[PDB]
């Protein structure tokens, strides 16, 4: 808590994601960078915005995904895209 | 066979003497040698070989093994076995 | 270390690494030093490092160590287990359930792990 | 009955005009509904979706 | 406050986890009792279907009103893993369809959870039965079934269906709607007239289908209860694990604070 | 937060919001083990309003625009009281729970529900 009060953002690595095969186990849900938004190049800045939302749309459906194949086309496409971005 | 009805009360009496002698306190205010207090006592309860008895009695007793069995008693507080003396 | 210097690979067995930590706590209290978190000695990480850093593989030979570990109050976050786990390379877990089936050795292939 | 098979389709209770009618009347009487309503039930989605989301989180 | 309150919460949740683990095996046991009762009632219904087929084909002189152009089953108790909700969700689709056609709807209720649903949204119930045992008797269904049969003979109902869950497998309960009323070289020695016989057998057939629907729904209920108590046992395990981590933090902090007060007091004396 | 300082309408709206959020906090352990479906018909309605109130309290700021991209919102006291009073009265029971998240004034929750 003291170091979080000094630094300009934190990359959280999660034990559950690492033991699940996702080796670069960055926890997007809570990892943040305060000054870095102004630091990205134009190509990475424009393409990254569409990708962070895809992982957020997956965050709410990931556990439930096994019984989500019979839902509406919107929920199914958001989940299918979320699995590919993950 | 020996019964020590309360080793926890022996530890409390030794803690009192140690604090009154101004010796440095540790966890639960017990002195640094409270483990050695009970260990020095309990390692005497043992079974000794025939050679030990023959050597000790200068050959007066032969072909027999002697022993001291101990049944120490300790009182816990609300089932907490993780306390220092227990 | 003498056997290692003869050009050999050696096994060092430590009956219990928790008792090594406790003996350090007892000596630190006898010397009057100010206690640290959870009542351990202030030198806890240095006393563990001085012992564990000699156990290594060198240009002449090596010392490999098997150390029995006791966990206080079943709390893996306690300073003694936490300081010890920073030096370990593998964890072998023995299961009472596997021994009941007649299998020996009673290692649990799911709970046991290695950095290798 | 058939030359190679005999089937008896029995009844668990003794049917009869009074027993047959009484149970039907008792099933009307048991549906003692002060206010019947209309049946429009426009809250369908608001109730179905609430329980669909709640039932998913539990497993 | 500290470690003492957390230790009491852990013991409380652990005591609850032990019974939900036992209730899963009790639900499996009762599921098997319901499955044997489902099989025991099949021979009677298939034979009544075989008699009505010949007794109608061979007698073109008479057509019963049931041969020319909802009863809802629900539980009486808690711990159902979406069983009743998935059934009402499936029913509302067909009731809405009948209102697109502009047709009026009559409803019959079996079980306490079904009565509460229609009462919370204003549904018109014509008949209702409740508080039946886990092993029901066909004589209790006669009343609710007759009111629905009479409404057909009075011309108030064009089609009648039974709404209930079907046992696909021990891990899958399917909500369904089944039509009830609208269904070779020798002839029988009809003792009474063949018309009198057809009138009685069609009534026995519909009651038997409702009884089979009720017994299969009870098998689906015990299977749903098994999953719900398995989930409750697993959910309690996650809460126990989190509380144990919070307890260990409080255990370590209490020892550190006591040692700080003893060292602080002995530095002054 | 006193009737003699802010008036009865504001005071009762604030007290109503706190009562709903307090009752929702008491049900958290029951909902975690058995789920929402076991609650009474009264508790189910209160939990649904508590979830909407909790989301309507959120607001995009003009200094937070760099973090996400969304434009900031300034909401007057009049608009604040009107939104929470309507949710407490049940005037928005039909709108979806995600329509209240990050929308400034109550009218924007009605437009967000159209998607």
UniProtKB/Swiss-Prot annotation, chain A:
Superkingdom of the organism of origin: Bacteria
Feature type site, description Required for activity: 31
Localisation: Cell inner membrane
Transmembrane domains' residue ranges: none
Subunit architecture: F-type ATPases have 2 components, CF(1) - the catalytic core - and CF(0) - the membrane proton channel. CF(1) has five subunits: alpha(3), beta(3), gamma(1), delta(1), epsilon(1). CF(0) has three main subunits: a(1), b(2) and c(9-12). The alpha and beta chains form an alternating ring which encloses part of the gamma chain. CF(1) is attached to CF(0) by a central stalk formed by the gamma and epsilon chains, while a peripheral stalk is formed by the delta and b chains.
Family label: Belongs to the ATPase alpha/beta chains family.
Function: Produces ATP from ADP in the presence of a proton gradient across the membrane. The alpha chain is a regulatory subunit.
Protein name as it appears in the record: ATP synthase subunit alpha
Organism field: Pseudomonas paraeruginosa (strain DSM 24068 / PA7)
Covered range of the whole protein: 344 to 429 of 514
UniProtKB/Swiss-Prot annotation, chain D:
Compartments reported by the entry: Cell inner membrane
Cysteines joined through disulfide linkages: none
Subunit (UniProt): F-type ATPases have 2 components, CF(1) - the catalytic core - and CF(0) - the membrane proton channel. CF(1) has five subunits: alpha(3), beta(3), gamma(1), delta(1), epsilon(1). CF(0) has three main subunits: a, b and c.
Family, per entry: Belongs to the ATPase epsilon chain family.
Function (record text): Produces ATP from ADP in the presence of a proton gradient across the membrane.
Protein name: ATP synthase epsilon chain
Species annotation: Pseudomonas paraeruginosa (strain DSM 24068 / PA7) (Pseudomonas aeruginosa (strain PA7))
Gene this chain is encoded by: atpC
UniProtKB/Swiss-Prot annotation, chain E:
InterPro entries membership: ATP_synth_F1_ATPase_gsu (IPR035968), ATP_synth_F1_gsu (IPR000131), ATP_synth_F1_gsu_CS (IPR023632)
Subcellular location: Cell inner membrane
A Pfam family annotated for this UniProt entry: ATP-synt
Membrane-protein topology: Peripheral membrane protein
Any single GO BP term: proton motive force-driven plasma membrane ATP synthesis
Keyword Zinc-finger: no
Gene Ontology, cellular component aspect: plasma membrane; proton-transporting ATP synthase complex
UniProt-listed SUPFAM superfamilies: ATP synthase (F1-ATPase), gamma subunit
A molecular function (GO) term: proton-transporting ATP synthase activity, rotational mechanism
Gene3D superfamilies registered for this protein in UniProt: 3.40.1380.10, ATP synthase, gamma subunit, helix hairpin domain (1.10.287.80)
Function: Produces ATP from ADP in the presence of a proton gradient across the membrane. The gamma chain is believed to be important in regulating ATPase activity and the flow of protons through the CF(0) complex.
Subunit structure: F-type ATPases have 2 components, CF(1) - the catalytic core - and CF(0) - the membrane proton channel. CF(1) has five subunits: alpha(3), beta(3), gamma(1), delta(1), epsilon(1). CF(0) has three main subunits: a, b and c.
UniProt similarity note: Belongs to the ATPase gamma chain family.
Protein name: ATP synthase gamma chain
Taxonomic lineage: Bacteria, Pseudomonadati, Pseudomonadota, Gammaproteobacteria, Pseudomonadales
Swiss-Prot record, chain F:
Compartments in which it is found: Cell inner membrane
Coiled coil: none
Transmembrane segments: none
Disulfide bonds: none
Annotated family: Belongs to the ATPase alpha/beta chains family.
Assembly and binders: F-type ATPases have 2 components, CF(1) - the catalytic core - and CF(0) - the membrane proton channel. CF(1) has five subunits: alpha(3), beta(3), gamma(1), delta(1), epsilon(1). CF(0) has three main subunits: a(1), b(2) and c(9-12). The alpha and beta chains form an alternating ring which encloses part of the gamma chain. CF(1) is attached to CF(0) by a central stalk formed by the gamma and epsilon chains, while a peripheral stalk is formed by the delta and b chains.
Function text: Produces ATP from ADP in the presence of a proton gradient across the membrane. The catalytic sites are hosted primarily by the beta subunits.
Protein's UniProt name: ATP synthase subunit beta
Entire protein: shown range: 343 to 457 of 458
């Amino acid at each position: 808590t003291n170091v979080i009060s000094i630094t300009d953002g934190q990359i959280f690595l999660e034990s559950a994601m690492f033991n699940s095969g996702i080796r670069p186990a960055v926890n997007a849900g809570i990892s943040v960078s305060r000054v870095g938004g102004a630091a990205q190049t134009k190509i990475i800045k424009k393409l990254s915005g569409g990708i962070r939302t895809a992982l957020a749309q997956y965050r709410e459906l990931a556990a439930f995904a096994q019984f989500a194949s019979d839902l509406d086309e919107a929920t199914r496409k958001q989940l299918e895209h979320g699995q590919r971005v993950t | 066979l020996i019964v020590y009805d309360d080793l926890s009360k022996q530890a409390v009496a030794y803690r009192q003497i140690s604090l009154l002698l101004r010796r440095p306190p540790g966890r639960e205010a017990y002195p640094g040698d409270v483990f050695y207090l009970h260990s020095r006592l309990l390692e005497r309860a043992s079974r000794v070989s025939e050679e030990y008895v023959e050597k000790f009695t200068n050959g007066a007793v032969t072909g027999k093994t002697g022993s001291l069995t101990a049944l120490p008693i300790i009182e816990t507080q609300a089932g907490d076995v993780s306390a220092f003396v227990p | 270390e003498k056997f290692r210097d003869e050009g050999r690979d050696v096994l060092l067995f430590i009956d219990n690494i928790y008792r090594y930590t406790l003996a350090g706590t007892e000596v630190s209290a006898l010397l009057g030093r100010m206690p640290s978190a959870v009542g351990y000695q202030p030198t806890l990480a240095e006393e563990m490092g001085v012992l564990q850093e000699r156990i290594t593989s060198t240009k002449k030979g090596s010392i490999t160590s098997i150390q029995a570990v006791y966990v206080p109050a079943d709390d893996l976050t306690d300073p003694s287990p936490a300081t010890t786990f920073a030096h370990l390379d593998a964890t072998v877990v023995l299961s009472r359930d596997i021994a009941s089936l007649g299998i020996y050795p009673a290692v649990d292939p799911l709970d046991s792990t290695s950095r290798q | 009955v058939q030359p190679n098979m005999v089937k008896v389709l029995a009844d668990t209770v003794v049917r009869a005009g009074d027993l047959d009618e009484a149970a039907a009347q008792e099933a009307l009487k048991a549906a003692e509904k002060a206010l019947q309503g209309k049946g429009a039930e426009f809250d369908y989605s608001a109730a179905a979706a609430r329980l669909a989301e709640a039932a998913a989180q539990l497993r | 406050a500290g470690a003492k309150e957390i230790r009491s919460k852990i013991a409380s949740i652990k005591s609850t986890q032990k019974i939900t683990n036992a209730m899963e095996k009790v639900a499996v046991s009762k599921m098997r009792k319901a499955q044997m009762r489902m099989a025991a009632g099949r021979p009677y219904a298939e034979r009544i279907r075989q008699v009505i087929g010949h007794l109608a084909n061979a007698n073109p002189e008479y057509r019963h009103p049931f041969m020319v152009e909802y009863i809802v089953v629900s539980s009486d108790r808690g711990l159902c893993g979406g069983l009743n909700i998935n059934l009402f969700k499936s029913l509302v689709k067909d009731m809405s369809g009948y209102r697109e056609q502009g047709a009026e709807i009559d409803l019959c209720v079996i079980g306490s959870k079904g009565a509460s649903f229609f009462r919370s949204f204003g549904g018109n119930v014509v008949a209702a039965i409740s508080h039946l045992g886990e092993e029901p008797s066909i004589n209790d269904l006669i009343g609710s079934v007759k009111v629905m049969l009479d409404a057909y003979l009075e011309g108030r109902i064009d089609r009648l269906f039974v709404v209930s869950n079907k046992f696909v497998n021990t891990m899958t309960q399917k909500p369904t709607v089944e039509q009830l009323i609208p269904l070779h070289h020798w002839d029988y020695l009809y003792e009474p007239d063949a018309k009198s016989l057809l009138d009685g057998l069609l009534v026995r057939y519909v009651e038997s289908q409702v009884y089979q629907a009720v017994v299969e729904n009870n098998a689906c209920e015990q299977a749903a209860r098994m999953i719900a108590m398995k989930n409750a046992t697993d959910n309690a395990g996650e809460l126990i694990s989190d509380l144990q981590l919070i307890y260990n933090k409080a255990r370590q902090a209490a020892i550190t604070q006591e040692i700080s007060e003893i060292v602080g007091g002995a530095a002054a004396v | 937060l006193d009737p003699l300082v802010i008036g009865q309408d504001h005071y009762d709206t604030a007290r109503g919001v706190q009562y709903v959020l307090q009752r929702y906090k008491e049900l958290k352990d029951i909902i975690a083990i058995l789920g929402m479906d076991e609650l009474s018909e009264a508790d189910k309605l209160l939990v649904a309003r508590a979830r909407k109130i909790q989301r309507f309290l959120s607001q995009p700021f003009f200094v937070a625009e760099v973090f996400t991209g969304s434009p900031g919102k300034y909401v007057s006291l009049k608009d604040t009281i009107a939104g929470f009073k309507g949710i407490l009265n049940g005037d928005y029971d039909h709108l979806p729970e995600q329509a209240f998240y990050m929308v400034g004034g109550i009218e924007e929750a009605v437009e967000k529900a159209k998607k």
